[PDB]
Design a protein around this ligand. Structure first.
Ligand SMILES: CC(C)(COP(=O)(O)O)[C@@H](O)C(=O)NCCC(=O)NCCS
Ligand SMILES: CC(C)(COP(=O)(O)O)[C@@H](O)C(=O)NCCC(=O)NCCS
Ligand SMILES: CC(C)(COP(=O)(O)O)[C@@H](O)C(=O)NCCC(=O)NCCS
Lengths: 157, 157, 157, 157, 157, 157
């Protein structure tokens, strides 16, 4: 169970909230895979290449964290890594019942596959990607909400 | 972080939902402490001594699980165990925002103390101790909702 | 299924919201049983006998409606009436997830027993017995919130 | 009231959850109309023709259930059938207040028109069309979630 | 603080609910600016020109209310008016946590900028723009839900 | 409307969240009445006299703020002050729908009486008196959650 975890996400963009979750989850698992979704259904603000580079840059200081691009079925991705744990983040604005529904769907597709929920720190408890995209989209200062080493990337495009 | 986890609760009484959380959370920590709080102010149906003895019997098969009854603040109890991770369960009828608040209250009181959330099995996602207490008080069949090694007792007193 | 419906409740006291549900649900079943639960553990403001007598008077105009007071599990009461359908009301302040849970708890206890939900009228969508008890305890005007054929009583004791 | 009910939906696709609701509702009403919406505002995964054929196939075993295509105002559709009852389904992931708002909107447009809520069985309480579309879209196995007689249709396109 | 308030919105279209909020808020502030957003992200049913004319017509009877078109960052707009108060409306169907998140985001961008929540009247508590657009889109009667002096405009296009 | 505001509460005890609401709401009204309700039926931890004396000391710096203890219906108390605006606070764990209901209940009882909602500061958005009472009862450090001018007292009795 504790050998490997997968943290799936659009990471559009990576926020301080996401970094808290990568931090706490990487401490518990011998290896954390951060799986960067295509999300085409959602038309993301940042391209996969941008979103992979932001999260790879934001996570250089974690040695057991690997970033992969992924466009498939999470249940299948976990099986190919022999992964028994999906990492998810919970925040004030979470659709909690939707999160539970997703945990039971993923476990129906892969009977080994459990879901574990982490919280960001209190200062980040009201951060959501959607806020950050709104503040970016409206040419506001998002620099307090995202790791400083990726702000140069987001602020542009 | 992986050395010790604390699963705190009133456990009035321990249900099958609680057992799924102990099962799953115990696989992630070298040692799991099940911490049964007096919870005087609540007016628990079962004495603190009955509740400890019920969970003690229901967990006897889990070799790295230890049960303790405590009178104080949970945040101080974790500091005494050098415990950095609280374990909580998430269910359909959880008060999700109150769990978040209690997570941050526990952090503000012990700055090393994160909260992590597991889910019970889908069959048990609809169990609450509060349902279980109604059925017990109206002298109904709760056999299907609690571990059988305790039902000798709740069914009686 | 259409032979008999049971509308269970504490009815402490019966409100205009409850009357809309009895009105609408009684049109769908050949016979509707209004089942007033003791609900000891709750600490109802009105005695079980006062609550039965209030709903009895408030429903006397509905010819296929019958009121009964019961001490036991609702699921067993429905089995005694060969009743397959529980009637419940949905309001703005309903605990929607708890209603769902209680529906499935009632099913797990009596495998023939579905729960169906009606709505009160829009004017009454904002009434709860809990509001009504606050107004009564602070000796205020609840006349607008309950059927007048009971207000002789609640207003007094 | 009990003569006819209408069960409106996109049915994109029909799930085991929808079949539970058609089952329980068809038992209460002398006739159930299943009204298959265009939903163009939502760009449905399956075409009206597919969605009409799936639900007509999934409901052959109910003799008092008719399927019609419909692109209009539910309030007007109910009036043309002299229908006094809209059937809706409630699940763990429901927007409960939105469901109430829709019941009062439909009753404002047609003062005869009441809304009644059914639950699916517990095994189906976490099924939603949106889950099923996600699992389909991601080339996952949705066969446990939809009636077997329509899986051949969905799995393709 | 009490000198000026800003009431931002898409107003797609202006509802009786919005007029209640403009009414109560204009009584508290020496001046209310109603800021009509582009909302392009949302593809609004009515054009900015329509939405500015509806709200300017619906508010002629309030002498301290000004309507402006606005496409920017609310935090910056408030600073240019030296405004310390964002007016927002709360209804049964509100995403309450999202409203709180937006209040803290706007205050992070402008440390002077507080958010104040008004309620519409009870008769309007279930009105939402989204309902009104649905009833319009479905060629239903929305005349009970929007000020009569703007119905001629909406009903057309 | 701007002449007088009433901020009603149990204030058991007054917290830093409450102080932010008094601070912000007092800037908007010529005079703010902090109305401490007996709330017998609740079983407040602090006597009505202790609660008045705590808020009295915590507000002594606010020159237009006056504290009063009352036994009756709030709606009648506002009528006695010729008060048209109730002030309430909104927090992460607020029961948002119950606040709305109580707003409309207060209106139906006093037809001139609107309710307005403020937010505390982000640091205090996660405080509830209920958290504070748990910490006090388990004899823990609540110093960080209440105004220090009261902590002489709560910490003791
Ligand atoms: C008992 C519990 C873990 C909650 O458990 P429950 O939800 O099973 O009742 C919580 O109330 C607790 O920690 N109680 C011990 C005393 C304490 O620390 N209270 C302050 C909480 S911030
Ligand atoms: C009284 C009620 C119908 C709920 O009614 P209420 O919401 O009006 O209090 C429910 O508590 C009930 O069924 N009580 C009787 C005993 C019972 O069956 N309890 C177990 C519920 S699964
Ligand atoms: C005390 C309160 C303001 C709510 O405050 P709280 O949420 O801090 O307990 C409310 O219960 C109240 O107004 N109580 C006084 C009596 C009353 O008017 N009750 C009827 C409410 S419609």
């Amino acid at each position: 169970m504790q050998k490997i975890g997968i943290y799936p996400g659009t990471f559009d963009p990576v926020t301080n909230g996401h970094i808290d979750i990568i931090h706490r989850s990487s401490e518990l698992f011998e290896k954390l895979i951060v799986a960067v979704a295509h999300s085409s259904a959602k038309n993301p603000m940042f391209s996969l290449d941008e979103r992979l580079k932001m999260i790879q840059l934001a996570t250089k200081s974690f040695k057991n964290v690997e970033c992969v691009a992924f466009e498939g079925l999470l249940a299948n991705l976990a099986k190919e890594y022999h992964c028994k744990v999906l990492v998810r983040g919970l925040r004030v604005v979470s659709d909690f019942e939707y999160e539970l529904q997703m945990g039971y769907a993923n476990k129906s597709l892969n009977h080994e596959l459990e879901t574990l929920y982490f919280m960001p720190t209190l200062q980040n408890a009201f951060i959501s990607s959607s806020i950050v995209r709104s503040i970016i989209a409206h040419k506001g200062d998002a620099s307090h909400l995202v790791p400083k080493e990726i702000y140069p990337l987001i602020s542009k495009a």
